[PDB]
């Protein structure tokens, strides 16, 4: 029911249901992003590492727009004899998010079987009966096979194979969205940006990097061919407005405006950009916050290290929950984010100093 | 009272009082370093990332001299309702150094208001009344404002804004200095070097890098434009001669000579350089130690990773205390350090092998 | 910038920079208080114990006005061989306030050398690496001397010698002050009172007692020669409006009005005085709080024990932080405190019952 048509409910479905580590047998997301973007951009290319490169042409400096598409997942490492799986996580995940339903196993493109991962048996002790946290060894997964032989006949093998099985639903039918955030909300901004951008006052290069959540320098490889002389990023990591907390996290997210990054673990944004975006949002009546973290590793950090020594600002689409399971967002912020970047790109020609 | 005129008491004042994260609204240190160095060097330039580049010209290999100017500081993240600030640290700091006086808030260049940060209230418990260590959440800061509105009318906003408010005083009027060490003692060597260097037997490039204490690869960006075929560094991290300790830390500092780095966490210095400097100090009767750490991240590590694969040695001006609050040094070592590098640079032409 | 001329910024400088244990070689504060007060009072005397006695003459009962001038400090107890000092505290101090800058050593009057005291090395253990609280043995101090011999040649000897090195700065240029509180804010009220008092309706005796923070009965000695038949006090000890706390401490200080003491550890104020001051502040539109503690030892307790059995009220100038390091105050309260006492003294003649 697109009362406003601000965020296309159909488009978000295509990207987010797709599996979130590319180049593997799951690589369909690559096709998806290029299947959309290419009609609005002059040319597009794929690097060796699974990165995607979209080059709109123009007159001006080279701007780099970075989003990550490496959604968290899990990896099978071996097959116990009873036909039940153990697993090893990809970096970033918290194991308390074991399951409530339906872990999906992507044997190959267009072939998925449902799986569950509920319980490593807690050890036998009385203080540990109170510690219902899972053991660190890691949790196990079930696909219902009785034996190792049956499991391999399905197609399960060792490899990075698994993901979370999200589906996109609407909460707060006034406005909010459930799982639209991690590793593709930024891309929706990018795609919406490409539709909204007509007059290229600066020659932009949209990238959608891989291996962000593990080895964030995955993004860096794309950078050198593309970046020089400016840079941007759209990644996120938040602890947002969870009740029972003090006010010191509340300003990170209140359900309002977009989030500019001044500081993270990795990156210290060149502050002229920040003050400029601050100026920009006020001129066009755009909402904005100023967010900082104590931790987290973003794409922007890898951009800062290319040989030119690039100055970088970063936007953030806020309001995540612990990024495994559900990933709430705000319809207002994402469309506002698009507006902001759209104007910044065109007005970048004056920013140069 | 410069009885010896070995270390100019006036010059050190200018650099160290200045605020220690550049590019921000505090960026005055940039002007300071170039305001001095430029009269003695042929040409000077500023990179995009806030790095400073001073290029003396000559006949020989390209030598790179690296010091950091990113003194530790703190960042406001939000504003509680009572007009009191919370904070988030920049990497490296220890929070037991909360305050004894006067945290300074650099709203903008030439505008500072004093602030205090003494106490997060310890939790209500009896073993914790004994644990007077601050909670890890982080400490809070006061500027005396009663409300959020009053605070923003001053000029306080979210951002990296704060520093420590050091001032330079003389202890052991025979010889020592109080806060002259961190993030500018190396620069004083550099500046003194530029005055002492007349005949450029090798074409040197003095850099003063930013974002060392966080994302040490901040220095790397300058490297590629400048470095090739040799490298040096002047950074420090020490646990020095604190009483009640064994002798295993005492050799790290005794109040004598300069410190050559063989090993750190990050960098393993190309040992030919080390043996050469060892040879050099003996030839000119210079004092020297040999220091190693188990931890710490220096500029030298980032130098080793540029594409040529550069060999690197590193000098250290010793005798720090836990780098937040007071930062004792030895007048003897710093002048000796200058002598050593001065001779090494000119004699580098024979080092090539 | 005395926009109001309510609190003289010059006067506070003289008292508070001075060293805060008298009779020692530091005793200059004694001269300071008498150098000011004597022009406005008929006569002044010094007792044997370092107490100061100022006797304005009049017609009425004998009123005693007590402030303490024994600011906290530290004492050297021995000299380790490496030229570094250990210390022993004076009562009241918390050792988590080790240093952030510049501990001052008063060898003698007008001779000071700066010192630092940062770190006792924490013991070697893993739960203790988390306990960054200092060991109770006590912290150590550095003055940069290499040996015991060098230290004594400076003038350092065993004795109570050390203080905190505060300096007075203005925060909240609308209104607040940094280190003006402990052991001399009360005296500024006293001095301001003496200027404001013209017509002595009761013969008052202003005292400035020593050895309050240790052996609070230090004040008592002055009492017997002076006190009989009434008594007052201006001392403080507070835990004030620190964020993250409940409301149960907030009324102790909110940045408003002065603080009357009903109860402490030591003293239970004769409540007729309290109700009278309550009545008084309402008649002249003066602001007031009512504050009580669970702990702390004030001058008033010692007054209650003189042979007559004196009834005593006590005023408090609020808003301290943990009294070692910074000592915030409110310009409004201190001037209001002066007004209150000024009127109470003259109207004491009706209070007698
Ligand atoms: Zn991570
Ligand atoms: Zn992420
Ligand atoms: Zn570090
Ligand atoms: Zn450092
Ligand atoms: Zn006490
Ligand atoms: Zn006290």
Numbering used by the authors:
A (entry chain A), B (entry chain J), C (entry chain L): 1 to 353
Show the paper's wording.
We apply the integrated NMR/EM approach to the dodecameric 12 × 39 kDa (468 kDa) large aminopeptidase enzyme TET2 from Pyrococcus horikoshii which forms a large hollow lumen encapsulating 12 peptidase active sites. The dodecameric assembly forms a tetrahedral structure with ca. 12 Å wide openings, one on each of the four tetrahedron faces, providing access to the ca. 50 Å wide catalytic lumen. NMR and EM thus provided structural information about TET2 on very different length scales, but neither of the two techniques by themselves allowed to determine the structure at the atomic scale, owing to the lack of long-range distance information in NMR, and the inability to build a robust model from the EM map.
Nonetheless, at 4.1 Å resolution, significantly better than the average of EM maps deposited over the last years, our EM data set is insufficient for de novo structure determination, highlighting the challenges that many EM data sets encounter. In step 3, a real-space structure refinement was applied in the XPLOR-NIH software, using the full Coulombic potential map, first at 8 Å, then at 6 Å and lastly at 4.1 Å resolution, and all NMR restraints, calculating the full dodecamer. We additionally explored a refinement with phenix.real_space_refine29 to refine these structures furthermore, and obtained an even slightly higher structure accuracy. In the general case, validation may comprise consistency checks against independent NMR data that have been left out from the calculation, or correlation with the EM map. In the case of TET2, a crystal structure was available, and the refined dodecameric structure is in excellent agreement with the crystal structure and the EM map. Possibly, interactions between residues in neighboring loops (residues 127–131) found to be in proximity in the EM map might stabilize the loop conformation, leading to a reduced but still visible density at cryogenic temperatures.
